[PDB]
Structures are given as structure tokens and as C-alpha cells.
Write an enzyme that holds these catalytic residues in place. Structure first.
Site, PDB file in Angstrom:
ATOM      1  N   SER A  77       0.469  -1.240  -0.302  1.00 50.12           N
ATOM      2  CA  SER A  77      -0.059   0.247   0.100  1.00 50.12           C
ATOM      3  C   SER A  77       1.390   1.454   0.111  1.00 50.12           C
ATOM      4  O   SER A  77       1.632   1.192  -0.573  1.00 50.12           O
ATOM      5  CB  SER A  77      -0.795  -0.144   1.064  1.00 50.12           C
ATOM      6  N   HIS A  95      -6.727  -6.754   0.200  1.00 48.59           N
ATOM      7  CA  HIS A  95      -5.245  -5.956  -0.071  1.00 48.59           C
ATOM      8  C   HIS A  95      -4.675  -6.473   1.348  1.00 48.59           C
ATOM      9  O   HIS A  95      -5.292  -5.595   2.929  1.00 48.59           O
ATOM     10  CB  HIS A  95      -6.222  -4.855  -0.172  1.00 48.59           C
ATOM     11  N   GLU A 113      -8.363  -6.166  -4.093  1.00 49.79           N
ATOM     12  CA  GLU A 113      -7.825  -4.886  -4.111  1.00 49.79           C
ATOM     13  C   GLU A 113      -8.820  -4.358  -3.128  1.00 49.79           C
ATOM     14  O   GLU A 113      -8.368  -2.831  -2.418  1.00 49.79           O
ATOM     15  CB  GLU A 113      -7.060  -3.906  -5.060  1.00 49.79           C
TER      16      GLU A 113
HETATM   17  I1  LIG Z   1      -5.751   3.116   5.635  1.00 52.57           I
HETATM   18  C1  LIG Z   1      -7.298   2.137   5.757  1.00 52.57           C
HETATM   19  C2  LIG Z   1      -8.630   2.795   5.075  1.00 52.57           C
HETATM   20  C3  LIG Z   1      -9.216   1.815   5.825  1.00 52.57           C
HETATM   21  C4  LIG Z   1      -9.394   0.336   7.335  1.00 52.57           C
HETATM   22  C5  LIG Z   1      -7.554   1.248   7.265  1.00 52.57           C
HETATM   23  C6  LIG Z   1      -7.013  -0.691   8.792  1.00 52.57           C
HETATM   24  N1  LIG Z   1      -5.992  -1.261   8.480  1.00 52.57           N
HETATM   25  C7  LIG Z   1      -5.866  -1.919   7.676  1.00 52.57           C
HETATM   26  C8  LIG Z   1      -4.798  -1.916   7.376  1.00 52.57           C
HETATM   27  C9  LIG Z   1      -4.192  -3.468   5.856  1.00 52.57           C
HETATM   28  N2  LIG Z   1      -5.148  -4.368   6.127  1.00 52.57           N
HETATM   29  C10 LIG Z   1      -6.314  -3.800   6.806  1.00 52.57           C
HETATM   30  C11 LIG Z   1      -7.387  -5.286   6.756  1.00 52.57           C
HETATM   31  C12 LIG Z   1      -8.192  -5.556   6.893  1.00 52.57           C
HETATM   32  C13 LIG Z   1      -8.902  -4.361   7.677  1.00 52.57           C
HETATM   33  C14 LIG Z   1      -8.305  -3.787   8.216  1.00 52.57           C
HETATM   34  C15 LIG Z   1      -6.314  -3.151   7.867  1.00 52.57           C
HETATM   35  C16 LIG Z   1      -2.972  -3.080   5.771  1.00 52.57           C
HETATM   36  C17 LIG Z   1      -1.897  -1.812   5.728  1.00 52.57           C
HETATM   37  C18 LIG Z   1      -2.455  -1.312   6.324  1.00 52.57           C
HETATM   38  C19 LIG Z   1      -3.500  -1.370   7.473  1.00 52.57           C
HETATM   39  C20 LIG Z   1      -6.603   1.394   6.733  1.00 52.57           C
END
Ligand SMILES: Ic1cccc(CNc2c3c(nc4ccccc24)CCCC3)c1
Ligand SMILES: *[C@@H]1O[C@H](CO)[C@@H](O[C@@H]2O[C@H](CO)[C@@H](O[C@@H]3O[C@H](CO)[C@@H](O)[C@H](O)[C@@H]3O)[C@H](O)[C@H]2NC(C)=O)[C@H](O)[C@H]1NC(C)=O
Ligand SMILES: Ic1cccc(CNc2c3c(nc4ccccc24)CCCC3)c1
Lengths: 537, 537
Positions: free
Chosen positions: B202, B444, B331
Site C-alpha cells: 500500500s 488488500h 484490492e
Molecule cells: I488507510 C485504511 C482504510 C480503511 C481501514 C484501515 C485499517 N487497517 C488495515 C491495513 C491493512 N489491511 C487491513 C485488512 C483488513 C482491515 C483493516 C486493514 C494492510 C496495510 C494498511 C493497514 C486502514
């Protein structure tokens, strides 16, 4: 003679055939109009002078003047659509097939297609022998003037006095006149005149459409079967101003000045009635640029066709109309092979590169905006399925979809909305003996023989399931003719509407689901919903 | 102690883990910058004051200030991405995993994601224990300032003198500083400093991108792995003028006037350094309207990011760059569930009607023209596959495709064109234990653990093929780190280019074809080729 029938215009003698174990009496070549010849060229048809003496109605009648496609000299598949009797302007003749609810037999009337430039009731493929015999119905067909003979349109270019000199749409006046003749004479053939069903294909289908909806004729027939042809289709209607321009070119093309049409029309028209029919037959085609855009078409005349086919519907109700309509799977393949024969082959597929996919697409839709062209090209871009072959397949789909399947779909939805009981079919069987190229799929017109019951002819080569399909497709026609509903006993075939755009699939494959909604809905969503919005600048 | 390593800034003491049968020495929480605190808030990082005494590098370091998503209180699947150590501005710390061509070990450096607003090197999921042990490589991670702490950008609003007051992109300066620290100290951990590979996901992936391409840093690292994140992506770059406007709102939002930024900036900045971090932590989010459009992002500063990421490439050659990049299958599902939680559920699918399909689509793309909106809505209209469920699936695809997969695709093609040896992957395994909803597919970030080799952890529950996939995906990373090429011995994984946009598919399904070209090419053709043309008025 028991083969003699007293018609409105005199006695006629016919033949006796015995097919499928029933006697039919086959009257071919009955004059229904005075020969639209010399002074009557380009004019409305006038009823035929009555005769006496048994009129020989045992041979085939003439073919209305037209040109024969010789793109494949000797290929049977092309020339079975070419005229099989002599070509002549003297061609306004009717055919009746008559077997040997309760006040007479149903009458089915066939109008052939051929893009309003070609076609003939006399083709073997239009033989109503089996349909009449097995259906136990009256079937009738007839010639109507095609090309500039049927559709020269110049009245706006001339003073009021000269209206009837070249009013346009006289080929649709012809059909009107033959259908009138058949109503008048239905009882003399054992037919119930209030029990009539029009049916046709391509331009014939659109003509069925015109005869059902024209104020000149409407009410007479309220039950029709339209096969791959509707008046909203781009090739099936034409403005008056474009018709005049085509007409003016033809008059010039036959060496008759045309710039005198206003100062002295009578002389310009004499000149055009002195021209040999063959010259008109050829020079009318000079005005053919654009695949599927013929110089002759049902023309907005404030008469037979008083408005553009879609502004007609917003005001007339159809609750008593029964409509059976549909399409074949590969509507556009043979039009694409003919108009792009340099690119494509009759027998084998073409690996069409991407630039030549664009070359053809950008031409076919050269008259749409570039926002449409880009949208269309994107909608028909192959990505999978091996390139090249796939590109040819998509341009064919685009042609079929834009020119037939989606206009039919659109008209079917508009007919249902105004009350007509619409039933929709989709023909997806490629006949086993088809010697067209495999890539051309299920050709436009491939369905005609099935609906006529020709696979029941044990002398032609068909597989057992194909004879089953013919027996099923003929029976859909006979049941539609008899009841306004094609559905057999216990066979589910529900009404088609925008809310439930369900269609019946005619296939020999017993593994598919006969009823379907989604695949046509998606195909034509592009043409009938999304592309209109692209057209907004 | 043998757990003690003499770094550039002093000796550090770490832990000894034995995983996968090899000793690793795990140094966590090494200061690489002075705490960006009080006067140093919003400013570029300054190198950490050297120490003496063994520095305890055995605990986890702090988490840079951020807010925790509590959309699902208690759901483990959400909070494993929340900070698992204390949140504080004092957070600039490095982590080194060091095992117990020939001049030292390869160094892999991980940059986490979290939309430049969240994220932490300390998450269990980023545990480099297995990767280091099995790969036999140095792995390093580190905190970098996120949110307004890392990205407040106001220098254009202020005189020349106050440039360093809030230059923007200091979070990318942080990363630059930690990567510099790791180059300086590579040899002290047994690492070859000329053998470094950046990798992230990301926003971390986009940060890998920024660190490879920034003039401030370029040349240092020329081998990177970008997972679902590229700087051309809409969420990963932001103009200076929009950054300033966000900054000005935040300053106002924290009750500090902001209209004095030009007349007396020093006072406005004092005010903003007196604000509690929690207040900034919250008020920065007021400027979040639009799914996937965070108030903090790599900002065009004429410094770290001197131009828009695609005008950078038209002039710099990349023949010596090795790039491994890719995407997951779904994604956009969790972004769509979070930004439209009113509509959707975490566990089960939503039968989304057509009007509410439009409600969401027209919102997500409210800032595109209506000719794009209509084109996008048409491109993602379901017709088959049971409605409703399908509509939710398509809006997810659209989000995933527009925001990650197609920007990545576009950047991958642009990187190949300028000489970089690009290898592309596509991750399509939904982990068996995933307790996200089935409709959310392959989330994602679902790939991160696989590339870290976590399925090799016999204490977590995985199926044998999942451990195979982890062993394969870790090995793609280790082989990419070691040779610039992820391909195993005899494994075919060819270079990705516009001419041959082939990618590798990571799946547990042994029945699929691992190499594929067409399906991503078609998906993103819409976004990267056709939609640009729609944008032309
Ligand atoms: I910016 C963002 C937008 C919406 C939700 C979040 C919560 N953080 C999350 C992250 C990642 N995977 C997840 C998978 C499921 C739910 C929340 C996730 C991976 C990298 C960034 C942080 C961050
Ligand atoms: C079924 O298919 C057969 C062909 O397999 C059709 O037979 C064809 O019948 C027509 C008319 O009966 C024949 O045309 C006639 O030719 C003679 C001279 O050849 C002529 O005197 C007639 O006036 C007419 O033009 C045609 O030759 C014949 N073809 C073949 C190959 O047999 C038959 O009509 C089809 N239909 C039915 C209902 O059986
Ligand atoms: I207008 C037209 C345009 C191109 C070719 C033709 C030739 N005539 C043909 C007709 C029909 N089906 C055919 C199938 C293959 C080849 C030619 C066919 C069915 C009805 C109209 C005439 C007519």
C-alpha cells in the site's frame, strides 16, 4: 375442375400436391395488380383488370426487377437467394397454398426480405407446401416492387399536381394491395379473412411491421411475426429528404437531368419511364455506400409511413396485437463478409489484426460520433479466445447487434409497453449442411427454412434433431397463427416485456435452458441504453 | 555480549531467536533520528545523538501517532492492523533481523503501509523472524511519521526563511534517513550495503517507489518490491496546493487561526507545536472526504518529489533497476466495506439493488466527469451471476481496479519502458483462516504474511498448500533480493512489459496456469487506455 377457384378477379386453376400425407392446392402467379409498367412505373399499384377463362396458376410468377449477387459464382449458398424465375417489371402476382376458429382456415401471409432491393416469393426456401400441409392453414406469398421501382420518392421535389408521379413506398402499397386481395378472397380458398397473420424476414419482417402499423392499413391485420427486421432498424427507414436525394441521383444516373424536376417534372418522369429497367436496376446501387444502408427503404411520406417509426408508437395502443419476433445468433456475418470481402473469406476464418479491426469498425460506424466509435470499438474489443479469429467474430457481433438484434429488442420492448402480446425467440442452430464458413455462425436468414418446416422434407438432408427443430419451429408459427401464442401444450414460453425480457431459444442442443433473459439484455443494453447517452455531446 | 552490535551511533544489544533451525539476532527499537518532538514536530528528521552504553534493543519501539480503526470492536481481523505498542511522537526507531555476492548478506528493508496515516513496523504480521532465518538475509524495518506529523505541508504559504518549518513529506525524509542508517551500518550487522532491496505494501509500496525515484535518494537503492502501491495511484500523490489547503484546515481545526501563516508564521507554528498530538491525530481526519483519498500523501515539493510521478519517468532511465510488483485479487473490498459500512456487512454478502449500486458508484467517482461515471458504471454493470451479490462484487472490483491494480499495471509498464527489469505477480489465494467475509475475497494486504513466510510458522493454522505458497512467496522475495529476479530454478517467470504484460499467479490451486497476460490487460485497458479518451470532452 376441383383445382379451379373463383377469385374476386376471375377463376384461377392451380396444382394439387400431396405432401406430409395431405392434399394442398397450390395456386402460383395470380395477378393482384396491373403490371406496374410503362406509365405505371413508380406509381401506386392499381387493382388488376378482372379476367375470365381459367387463369393458369400452375407456374411460378416473374421476379421483380433486381440484380443478382454473384460474389461467389457457382456457390449454391449465394444463388439460392438469387431470382429463380425471369426478372421483369410485370411481377405483381400472388401465391396461395390451400389445404384440400370455425369459419374457415387461418391465413398466413409471407413477405420476403432482401433489403428492399432484392427478394422474391418464388424462392424454393419460401415454399409453403409443408407449412400449409402440416399446419393445415392457408399460406400466401406475393411479389412487391423492390429497389427504385418500389421506392423512388420525389413528390416533395414536385408540385402538388404531380404527387402520384413518384410518391415513394409503392412496394409497401403493393403489399397492402396483395393483403387486401387475400382478405377479399380468403373465403374462396377456404380461409377465414378475420384470421390473418403476416410474417416475414429482414425487410419482409420490417414490411410486416409497416403493414401492421401504417394508418393506410392498420386494423386489417393485428397478428404478425417479424424475423430479424423492425422499422426502427437503421436500414429499414429513411427520411423523405434522403429518399429525394437518392432519387435525384438515380434520375441523374439514368441520364435524365433531375434538375428539371421542379420546372417540368412530367418530362423528367417520361425520361425515367423510357429508361430500360436494367439501367435503373444498376444505377440505383450507385447510392449504396455504407454496409446495411440501401438506397431504398420505407420512407417517411406522411401517408403510408407518416412519422419516424418510434414517434408512431408513443400514441397508438396495441392491446389486440399479437407479435412473434426474434433473431438469429450471427445476424451480421454474411453482411460483413459481403461488404468486406477483401478482408474475409467465405469458408475459413480470418485472423484479423488489430489495426484492420479498427479499419473495419471505424468504417462501419464512420457516421457515428467518435465518442460512439471509441465506445463501440471498446465494447467489441476481444481480449481472450485467440486474437484475430476473435476480432472478426466481434465485428460480426457488432454488425448483427447494431443492425438487427438490438433494434428488434428495442422494438419488442416498445411493442410490449403499448399492450401488444409479444413473444421473443432466438435462433442458435447452425444447420449441419450449411456450407457457409463455420466462422459465419448462424446466418441471418438461416431460420427461414426451419419456420417453414423444410427439415420435415425427407428428401433434403437434415439430422433427426434438425427435423425436430423444424417441426418445433413450424409449430411455433402455426400455433402463433392459430392462437396468437407460439407456446405448445405444457411448453413454457412467456410473454416478452421490458420488465421480463425473456426469450425462447431454438436449438438442437437439449442441454441448454430454452428460456433466457440476461444475454440479449446485456448485448443490447449497450446499443439501446448506454450509447444514446454517449451521443449527448 | 555476542548479542551486542556496535552501530554508527553506539552499541546496541538485541535478542537471540532460533526459528526454522537457525539463530537470528533481533535488534528492535534503535533510534535513527532525534525524537521529532516539540520544536522538531513537522520538521525534517535530524540524525540521532550518538550514545554509549549498550542500548536495550530487545523491546518493540513506539508507534507513530495515529488513530485506531474500531469499526469492529473486538474483531481480531481489524485490530491486528492497529498499533500494538504505545502511540507517541517519539517513534523514529529501526529494527534489524540479522542471521547468526560474497561481501556480506543481502539487506531487505520493509516500509509498512496504512495510507500515510497509520501503520507500524511493530505489527506481528511484519515479523521478519522467518524471512531472515529461512532467507538467510538481513531484514530491517522502521517507523516513519504518518499523517499530518509526516506530511503537513505549508512552506509555499510562508516566506523563504520559514521553508524548513513545514516542508512536507518529512515521513519520506524519515524513511530516507532510516535507509541511510542501514547503509551506514549494514556491515556491522553482517550485511552488504550495496546489496539492499526495499519492499512494502500500500503506502509502503508507494514509499519504496518514492525512495527509488526521488532525486534526494536515487541511486542508493535500485532494487525494490512494490505490493499494491505505486506513486501514480490517486491516493499516493497530492499537489502542493491541495496539501497546503489540507494543512490550513488542520491548523484551523486545531484552533490556531492559519490565516496568519503569511503575516506571522512563527506564531502559527508555535501554536501547532503546543497542540496535543491527539488533537492533530483526530482533526487531520476532518479533511478526509472521498474513499481512498487521505489528507496525507507524498506531495509535489520540488525536493523529495519534484514533479508529478508520471512526468518524472519521461526523462530518467532505469536499466539498472530491478522491480518486483503486483496486486491481490480483491484490492478494494475492505476499503469499500469501511467507507460504505452502512451498506455492507463484514461477514456476509449484500444483495445491492441497482439504485444503490448507482448511489455508491456515483459517489466513489463523483469527481470524475459524468461521461466517465456513465462509462465506469457501464463497465462494472453486472448482468449475470445473481444480481445484488454481483453488484457489490463489481463496485469492489471497480475500487480495487481504479485505485491499485490498474495504477500498478500502468506504472509497471512505464517502468519497463525505461529499462527496469520488472516482474509482476497476482495474488489470488484467500487464506483458509481468513475471518473476513467470503464476499471480500482476497483482501488488500492478505499477501503480506505470505511474502514474509508466515505460513511456515507451524504454530499458526494453515493448510499444507498454504505453507507451500508461503514458502514459494517468501522464496520469490529472497530470490528477488539476492538476484533481482524472483524466478526459482526451472520456474518460468518472464519479465513484464507492455509488449508482453505477463504476470505470475500465486495460488494454492495447482490446476490454474501460473503465467497469464489477458485478464489484467483487459481489466485495466479500461482505466489506462479507454477512459483517458472519454476524459477528452
Ligand atoms: I488507510 C485504511 C482504510 C480503511 C481501514 C484501515 C485499517 N487497517 C488495515 C491495513 C491493512 N489491511 C487491513 C485488512 C483488513 C482491515 C483493516 C486493514 C494492510 C496495510 C494498511 C493497514 C486502514
Ligand atoms: C423437398 O425437397 C425436394 C428436393 O430434395 C424438392 O423437390 C423439387 O421439387 C420441385 C417441384 O416439385 C422441382 O422443380 C420442378 O422441376 C420440374 C423439372 O425439373 C419442372 O417441370 C417443375 O415445374 C418444377 O420447376 C425440383 O426439381 C425438385 N428438386 C429435387 C432435387 O427433387 C421438393 O419440392 C421439396 N418440397 C417438398 C414439399 O417435398
Ligand atoms: I440485401 C443483401 C446484402 C448482401 C448479400 C445479399 C444476398 N442475398 C441473401 C438473402 C438472404 N440470406 C442470404 C444468406 C447468404 C448469402 C446471401 C443471402 C435472406 C433474405 C434476403 C436475401 C443480399
Amino acid at each position: 375442375d376441383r383445382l379451379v377457384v373463383q377469385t374476386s378477379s376471375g377463376p384461377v386453376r392451380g396444382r394439387s400436391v400431396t405432401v406430409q400425407g395431405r392434399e394442398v392446392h397450390v395456386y402460383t402467379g395470380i395477378p393482384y395488380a396491373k403490371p406496374p409498367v410503362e406509365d405505371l412505373r413508380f406509381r401506386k399499384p392499381v387493382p388488376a383488370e378482372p379476367w375470365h377463362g381459367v387463369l393458369d396458376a400452375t407456374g411460378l410468377s416473374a421476379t421483380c426487377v433486381q440484380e443478382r449477387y454473384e460474389y461467389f459464382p457457382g456457390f449454391s449458398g449465394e444463388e439460392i437467394w438469387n431470382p429463380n424465375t425471369n426478372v421483369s417489371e410485370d411481377c405483381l402476382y400472388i401465391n396461395v397454398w390451400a389445404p384440400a376458429t370455425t369459419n374457415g382456415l387461418p391465413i398466413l401471409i409471407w413477405i420476403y426480405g432482401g433489403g428492399f432491393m432484392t427478394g422474391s416469393a418464388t424462392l424454393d426456401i419460401y415454399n409453403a407446401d409443408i407449412m400449409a400441409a402440416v399446419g393445415n392453414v392457408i399460406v400466401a406469398s406475393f411479389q412487391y416492387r423492390v429497389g427504385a421501382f418500389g421506392f423512388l420518392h420525389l413528390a416533395p421535389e414536385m408540385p402538388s399536381e404531380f404527387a402520384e408521379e413518384a410518391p415513394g413506398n409503392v412496394g409497401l402499397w403493393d403489399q397492402a394491395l396483395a393483403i387486401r386481395w387475400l382478405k377479399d378472397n380468403a373465403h374462396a380458398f377456404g380461409g377465414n379473412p378475420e384470421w390473418m397473420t403476416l410474417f416475414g424476414e429482414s425487410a419482409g419482417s420490417s414490411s410486416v411491421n409497416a403493414q401492421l402499423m401504417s394508418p393506410v392499413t392498420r386494423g386489417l391485420v393485428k397478428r404478425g411475426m417479424m424475423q430479424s427486421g423492425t422499422m426502427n432498424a437503421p436500414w429499414s427507414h429513411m427520411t423523405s429528404e434522403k429518399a429525394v436525394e437518392i432519387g435525384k441521383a438515380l434520375i441523374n444516373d439514368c441520364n435524365c437531368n433531375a434538375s428539371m424536376l421542379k420546372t417540368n417534372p412530367a418530362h423528367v418522369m417520361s425520361c425515367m419511364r423510357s429508361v430500360d429497367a436494367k439501367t435503373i436496376s444498376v444505377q440505383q446501387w450507385n447510392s449504396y455506400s455504407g454496409i446495411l444502408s440501401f438506397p431504398s427503404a420505407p420512407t417517411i411520406d406522411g401517408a403510408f409511413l407518416p412519422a419516424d417509426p418510434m414517434t408512431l408508437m408513443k400514441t397508438a395502443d396495441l392491446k389486440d396485437y399479437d407479435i412473434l419476433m426474434g433473431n438469429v445468433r450471427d445476424e451480421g456475418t454474411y453482411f460483413l463478409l459481403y461488404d468486406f470481402i477483401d478482408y474475409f473469406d467465405k469458408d475459413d476464418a480470418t485472423a484479423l489484426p488489430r489495426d484492420k479491426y479498427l479499419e473495419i469498425m471505424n468504417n462501419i460506424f464512420g457516421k457515428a460520433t467518435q465518442a460512439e466509435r471509441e465506445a463501440i470499438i471498446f465494447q467489441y474489443t476481444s481480449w481472450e479466445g485467440n486474437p484475430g479469429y476473435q476480432n472478426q467474430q466481434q465485428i460480426g457481433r457488432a454488425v448483427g447487434d447494431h443492425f438487427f438484434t438490438c433494434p428488434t429488442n428495442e422494438y419488442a420492448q416498445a411493442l410490449a409497453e403499448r399492450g401488444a402480446s409479444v413473444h421473443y425467440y432466438y435462433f442458435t442452430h447452425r444447420t449441419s449442411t450449411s456450407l457457409w464458413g463455420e466462422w459465419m455462425g448462424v446466418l441471418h436468414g438461416d431460420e427461414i427454412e426451419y419456420f417453414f418446416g423444410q427439415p420435415l422434407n425427407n428428401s433434403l438432408q437434415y439430422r433427426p434433431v434438425e427435423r425436430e427443430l423444424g417441426k418445433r419451429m413450424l409449430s411455433a408459427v402455426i400455433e402463433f397463427a392459430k392462437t396468437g401464442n407460439p407456446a405448445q401444450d405444457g411448453e413454457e414460453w412467456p410473454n416478452f416485456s421490458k420488465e421480463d425480457p425473456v426469450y425462447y431459444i431454438f436449438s438442437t442442443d437439449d442441454k441448454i435452458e430454452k428460456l433466457a433473459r440476461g444475454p440479449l439484455a446485456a448485448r443490447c443494453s449497450f446499443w439501446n441504453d448506454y450509447l444514446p447517452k454517449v451521443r449527448s455531446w
